[PDB]
Amino acid sequence: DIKHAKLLILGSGPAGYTAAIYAARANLKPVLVTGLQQGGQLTTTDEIENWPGDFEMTTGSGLMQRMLQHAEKFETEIVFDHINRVDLSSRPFKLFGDVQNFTCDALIIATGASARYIGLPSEENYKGRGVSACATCDGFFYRNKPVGVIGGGNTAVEEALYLANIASTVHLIHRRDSFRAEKILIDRLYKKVEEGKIVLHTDRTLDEVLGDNMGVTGLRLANTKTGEKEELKLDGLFVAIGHSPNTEIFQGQLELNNGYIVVKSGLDGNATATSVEGVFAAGDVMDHNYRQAITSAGTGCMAALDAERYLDAQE
Amino acid sequence: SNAMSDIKHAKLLILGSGPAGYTAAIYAARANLKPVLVTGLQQGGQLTTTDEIENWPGDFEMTTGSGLMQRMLQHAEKFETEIVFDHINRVDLSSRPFKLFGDVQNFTCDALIIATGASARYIGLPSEENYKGRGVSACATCDGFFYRNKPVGVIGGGNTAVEEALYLANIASTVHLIHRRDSFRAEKILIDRLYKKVEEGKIVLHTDRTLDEVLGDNMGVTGLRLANTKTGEKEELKLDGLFVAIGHSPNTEIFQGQLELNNGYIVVKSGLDGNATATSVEGVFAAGDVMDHNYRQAITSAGTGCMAALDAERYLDAQ
Ligand SMILES: Cc1cc2nc3c(=O)[nH]c(=O)nc-3n(C[C@H](O)[C@H](O)[C@H](O)COP(=O)(O)OP(=O)(O)OC[C@H]3O[C@@H](n4cnc5c(N)ncnc54)[C@H](O)[C@@H]3O)c2cc1C
Ligand SMILES: Cc1cc2nc3c(=O)[nH]c(=O)nc-3n(C[C@H](O)[C@H](O)[C@H](O)COP(=O)(O)OP(=O)(O)OC[C@H]3O[C@@H](n4cnc5c(N)ncnc54)[C@H](O)[C@@H]3O)c2cc1C
Numbered sequence: 001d002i003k004h005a006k007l008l009i010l011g012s013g014p015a016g017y018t019a020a021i022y023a024a025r026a027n028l029k030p031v032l033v034t035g036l037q038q039g040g041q042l043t044t045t046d047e048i049e050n051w052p053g054d055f056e057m058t059t060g061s062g063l064m065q066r067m068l069q070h071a072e073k074f075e076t077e078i079v080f081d082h083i084n085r086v087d088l089s090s091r092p093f094k095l096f097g098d099v100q101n102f103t104c105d106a107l108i109i110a111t112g113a114s115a116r117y118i119g120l121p122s123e124e125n126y127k128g129r130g131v132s133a134c135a136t137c138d139g140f141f142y143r144n145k146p147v148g149v150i151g152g153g154n155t156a157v158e159e160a161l162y163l164a165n166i167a168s169t170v171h172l173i174h175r176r177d178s179f180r181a182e183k184i185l186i187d188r189l190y191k192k193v194e195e196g197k198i199v200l201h202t203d204r205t206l207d208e209v210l211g212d213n214m215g216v217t218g219l220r221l222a223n224t225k226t227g228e229k230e231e232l233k234l235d236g237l238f239v240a241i242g243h244s245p246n247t248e249i250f251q252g253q254l255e256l257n258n259g260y261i262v263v264k265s266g267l268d269g270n271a272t273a274t275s276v277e278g279v280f281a282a283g284d285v286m287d288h289n290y291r292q293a294i295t296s297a298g299t300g301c302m303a304a305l306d307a308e309r310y311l312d313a314q315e
Numbered sequence: 316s317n318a319m320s321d322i323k324h325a326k327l328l329i330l331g332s333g334p335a336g337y338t339a340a341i342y343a344a345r346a347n348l349k350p351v352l353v354t355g356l357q358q359g360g361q362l363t364t365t366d367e368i369e370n371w372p373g374d375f376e377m378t379t380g381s382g383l384m385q386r387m388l389q390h391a392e393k394f395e396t397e398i399v400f401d402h403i404n405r406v407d408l409s410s411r412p413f414k415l416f417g418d419v420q421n422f423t424c425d426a427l428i429i430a431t432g433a434s435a436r437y438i439g440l441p442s443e444e445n446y447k448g449r450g451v452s453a454c455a456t457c458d459g460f461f462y463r464n465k466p467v468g469v470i471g472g473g474n475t476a477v478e479e480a481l482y483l484a485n486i487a488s489t490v491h492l493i494h495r496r497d498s499f500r501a502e503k504i505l506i507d508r509l510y511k512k513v514e515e516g517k518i519v520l521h522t523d524r525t526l527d528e529v530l531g532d533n534m535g536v537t538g539l540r541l542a543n544t545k546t547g548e549k550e551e552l553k554l555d556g557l558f559v560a561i562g563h564s565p566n567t568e569i570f571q572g573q574l575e576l577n578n579g580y581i582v583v584k585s586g587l588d589g590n591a592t593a594t595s596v597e598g599v600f601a602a603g604d605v606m607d608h609n610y611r612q613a614i615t616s617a618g619t620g621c622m623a624a625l626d627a628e629r630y631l632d633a634q
């Protein structure tokens with residue numbers, strides 16, 4: 001039972017929904033596939049303060065529910081599925097889902113990015129039993145208990161700041177001695193450090209995630225300059241070492257650059273066009289530099305307008 | 316006041332109070348760049364000349380362009396952006412701090428984000444120039460109230476002309492939509508709404524027509540002479556106001572000879588490796604419709620405004 005769409009959008013983050021809204025207003029009758037994280041990465045943050053025009057109190061989940069209802073306002077067909085294989089070698093394009101299969105005349109890819117892991121066997125062993133990559137999902141378990149966050153970028157800082165309202169102590173662990181985040185969040189971070197609420201463990205790498213048959217009980221860390229080992233007692237570990245683009249299913253199907261989908265870019269339009277004619281990409285899956293909801297939504301709009309111009313040219 | 320007190324220095328200066336400029340201010344303020352934003356003469360930008368906006372993602376109920384832009388203003392002020400009411404009439408980008416000269420005061424800055432957008436074009440006729448402010452307008456929300464229950468004309472065939480015709484269709488007695496082709500290029504949902512109004516007779520289509528002259532008396536417009544594009548048959552139309560909606564041109568006259576331009580748009584690096592809003596002058600960035608001749612949406616302008624703030628932060632940090 002192959003479901004055919006004129007325009008198929010993969011992803012229910014801000015790029016996917018913005019593409020759907022524009023495509024629906026162009027009378028393209030878009031079909032949007034949600035994926036397994038409906039709403040996208042913003043559903044794993046708490047307050048969003050830099051969505052322009054939301055100056056009061058907006059949560060990531062609240063914003064993405066608005067975008068869902070916006071796409072539905074213009075009758076976007078929203079389908080739950082997870083695409084596990086694509087074949088772009090001929091048209092119409094073929095996509096293979098956990099629930100059903102699809103074909104389409106134009107494809108907008110907005111599959112975003114997902115958290116990476118450090119790769120230790122002990123880390124794997126405790127995934128979903130005290131090792132997590134989503135602070136808002138699992139933070140409540142650690143009310144008044146010690147937790148760890150590993151990483152030094154804008155995700156690690158946001159997760160440490162979120163957990164600082166919940167945990168007794170947040171141990172923020174990084175293999176360098178400085179952090180990279182919006183400066184307003186660096187300011188908040190160091191205030192919590194001066195209050196003793198966040199404890200910094202700089203120039204440290206994870207050596208082993210420790211625990212028992214229930215869950216995590218601590219970490220062994222290694223000094224990046226001496227090799228010297230140390231142990232830390234804690235109840236949960238949040239791995240925040242970066243989100244890599246969700247493009248495994250496009251290996252061998254599209255031009256990628258370090259996993260990001262290569263698009264035309266440029267100043268002459270058709271800027272979201274991939275290496276395959278009729279396939280476009282928007283949002284974090286093609287952006288390794290800005291990584292914002294607002295920039296993802298902007299390229300989502302561009303992909304819809306690019307896809308409209310392409311379908312118009314097919315007669 | 317003296318020449319020294321008229322020179323405000325900003326670490327980062329943003330020109331324009333449309334969605335590109337305000338989004339840049341929000342990000343720049345959160346990057347501790349203490350931004351100063353110069354509003355220009357159209358505070359809030361082009362969206363203050365439209366009524367409802369239906370494609371700002373996440374605004375699914377009833378939002379107007381002016382409502383959204385007032386929100387963005389308050390958002391920039393939340394992070395303590397300094398908002399300055401001025402219009403820049405000249406710049407010198409040859410030295411750092413960059414020098415800008417305003418109608419009200421002068422400025423210097425360590426980095427500059429240009430988000431000056433675009434303004435409505437006029438056809439270029441003497442009769443059209445003669446009746447500006449006397450019945451010739453390029454802003455339907457500004458002036459439409461004065462034509463309640465009177466006939467009006469809109470000229471143009473694109474998204475702006477259709478949206479302005481749809482707006483005036485609720486105010487004028489009749490809207491005459493005039494265009495030099497038989498076809499209109501706008502969002503297909505808007506085209507559907509246009510033809511519902513045409514079929515209701517509230518909008519009357521004048522296809523294959525060009526403006527030959529704008530007619531009036533000592534006090535203001537009284538009609539138009541149109542020319543058939545096919546034959547050349549001239550004809551006259553009685554109406555009280557004309558809204559010219561033939562597109563917008565990027566506001567870059569003050570950057571001529573200062574930045575690389577292409578058909579008046581500011582050329583930026585673009586690309587996929589960051590620093591995408593950098594102009595030909597190091598430390599100067601451009602965002603929004605002033606650099607985008609292809610998409611021209613609020614959401615795309617806001618996205619590039621964010622990029623310009625992040626690029627300017629990376630530039631200032633490196634100094
Ligand atoms: C903790 C955290 C905090 C953040 N805070 C902010 C903030 O304050 N401000 C801000 O601007 N940005 C913030 N961001 C970044 C922002 O969330 C992203 O830039 C944005 O969500 C990117 O949107 P996107 O649509 O490109 O992708 P995503 O939001 O990642 O959405 C991808 C979508 O694709 C779907 N998908 C993935 N793989 C498949 C598949 N195989 N088949 C089908 N569907 C698939 C997913 O289910 C998801 O719905 C934050 C990110 C994180 C992780
Ligand atoms: C009638 C109409 C309807 C529209 N409807 C929609 C819609 O429904 N959805 C949508 O997404 N988009 C819509 N748009 C387009 C949208 O308004 C623009 O894409 C967007 O406003 C561009 O933002 P910007 O910040 O780049 O420029 P602008 O909004 O043009 O802002 C430019 C700013 O720069 C300032 N400025 C200019 N020159 C100077 C100077 N010399 N010194 C200082 N400041 C200066 C101006 O005062 C202004 O504040 C519409 C446009 C029009 C005209």
Ligand code: NA
Nearest residue numbers: 376377378379
């Ligand atoms: Na409202």
